[PDB]
């Protein structure tokens, strides 16, 4: 239970970064 | 304490998606 | 370990909000 929740979070963690960088993406453009 | 951090990480993963389904509609359409 | 898998998941709230702000800007323009 606990090591799924930890591997959850570090899968948002990821999923976030790459968000990130798709948005500064196409903020310009 | 643990249901409470579960539903956190589980409204993070929702609100991922509607995150990135609103990104492919702003890019794509 | 419960502590930092805390913050890591309040670190990541704060993300994800930052980037729905800045999706709802490109959204207006
Ligand atoms: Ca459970
Ligand atoms: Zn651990
Ligand atoms: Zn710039
Ligand atoms: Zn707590
Ligand atoms: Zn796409
Ligand atoms: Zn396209």
């Not at 239970?1 to 948005?23: D, G, P, T």
């Amino acid at each position: 239970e606990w090591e799924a929740l930890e591997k959850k979070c570090a899968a948002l963690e990821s999923k976030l970064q790459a968000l990130e960088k798709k948005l500064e993406a196409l903020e310009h453009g």
